[PDB]
Amino acid sequence: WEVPRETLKLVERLGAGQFGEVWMGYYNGHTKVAVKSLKQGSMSPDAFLAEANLMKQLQHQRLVRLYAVVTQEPIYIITEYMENGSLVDFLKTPSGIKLTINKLLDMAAQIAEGMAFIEERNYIHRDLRAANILVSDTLSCKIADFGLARLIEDNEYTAREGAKFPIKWTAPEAINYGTFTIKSDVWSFGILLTEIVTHGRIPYPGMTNPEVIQNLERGYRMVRPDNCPEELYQLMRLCWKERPEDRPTFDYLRSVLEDFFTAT
Ligand SMILES: CC1(C)CC(NC(=O)c2cccc(-c3cc4nccc(Nc5cccc(O)c5)n4n3)c2)CC(C)(C)N1O
Numbered sequence: 001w002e003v004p005r006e007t008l009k010l011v012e013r014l015g016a017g018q019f020g021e022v023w024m025g026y027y028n029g030h031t032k033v034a035v036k037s038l039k040q041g042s043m044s045p046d047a048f049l050a051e052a053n054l055m056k057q058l059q060h061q062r063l064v065r066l067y068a069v070v071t072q073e074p075i076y077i078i079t080e081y082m083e084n085g086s087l088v089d090f091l092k093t094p095s096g097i098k099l100t101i102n103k104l105l106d107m108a109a110q111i112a113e114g115m116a117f118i119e120e121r122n123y124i125h126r127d128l129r130a131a132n133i134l135v136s137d138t139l140s141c142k143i144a145d146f147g148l149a150r151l152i153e154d155n156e157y158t159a160r161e162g163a164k165f166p167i168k169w170t171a172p173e174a175i176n177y178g179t180f181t182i183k184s185d186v187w188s189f190g191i192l193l194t195e196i197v198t199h200g201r202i203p204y205p206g207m208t209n210p211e212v213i214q215n216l217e218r219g220y221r222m223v224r225p226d227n228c229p230e231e232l233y234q235l236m237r238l239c240w241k242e243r244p245e246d247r248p249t250f251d252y253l254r255s256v257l258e259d260f261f262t263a264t
């Protein structure tokens with residue numbers, strides 16, 4: 001997994017974030033790759049590398065593939081390259097905008113497919129959102145960013161108190177109690193789905209995070225997004241059941257979604 005840093009040539013910078021940059025580059029000359037670099041101090045090298053250690057365990061076509069690491073500062077994680085970058089952004093590009101509901105549903109089923117694998121392997125992602133989905137040059141999607149991912153032996157993960165999460169994507173039980181499960185990711189997927197029909201629009205447009213929390217306590221869910229197919233909205237609804245155990249599996253989601261876009 002470890003390789004010389006001299007085997008890479010960084011070309012374009014793609015993002016920067018609090019914890020480091022993402023680069024488009026070349027490995028051993030002819031291979032296009034993505035390179036994630038760590039900001040010396042944003043977190044320990046091991047903490048950064050923990051993502052790689054995990055990608056070694058979670059390999060699947062529908063999941064971004066780890067290539068190698070450079071374990072001397074600046075630390076690098078080197079991976080498969082996704083030409084179209086982040087799904088939130090791509091959906092807004094001239095290409096993404098012209099995408100038919102049929103293709104969007106296809107992309108949704110691909111994401112559920114990857115999560116089903118993650119589910120099968122007893123992992124949780126905990127950060128499932130459109131930003132963390134990457135699009136290839138053939139418009140296939142792969143899950144990425146397993147920084148918050150966790151192996152769940154006893155059905156549930158209990159977040160370190162003081163941990164802050166994207167309220168609008170996070171399941172209530174996780175927000176209020178800090179308890180995460182795959183059912184908790186299923187909730188995030190529902191929010192992801194809205195993010196797909198609205199071509200990368202923020203969930204709960206115009207609302208504050210506390211506003212959202214209160215509404216969910218009242219039993220409200222997100223208002224029907226504009227131009228959202230009703231059958232898709234109701235599937236979005238399953239993901240949002242009050243009881244985590246009543247939310248469906250990712251394999252059920254895939255199956256239905258595959259049905260939805262086969263029906264168009
Ligand atoms: C050149 C340009 C303007 C780049 C654009 N992408 C971006 O701006 C962009 C911005 C931020 C991130 C990424 C991107 C692409 C990609 N692949 C593979 C892997 C990663 N990361 C990564 C790596 C390891 C772990 C992880 O958890 C994420 N990443 N990260 C791309 C896309 C278009 C406009 C078509 N093209 O034309």
Ligand SMILES: [Ca+2]
Binds near residue numbers: 093094095096
């Ligand atoms: Ca375009």
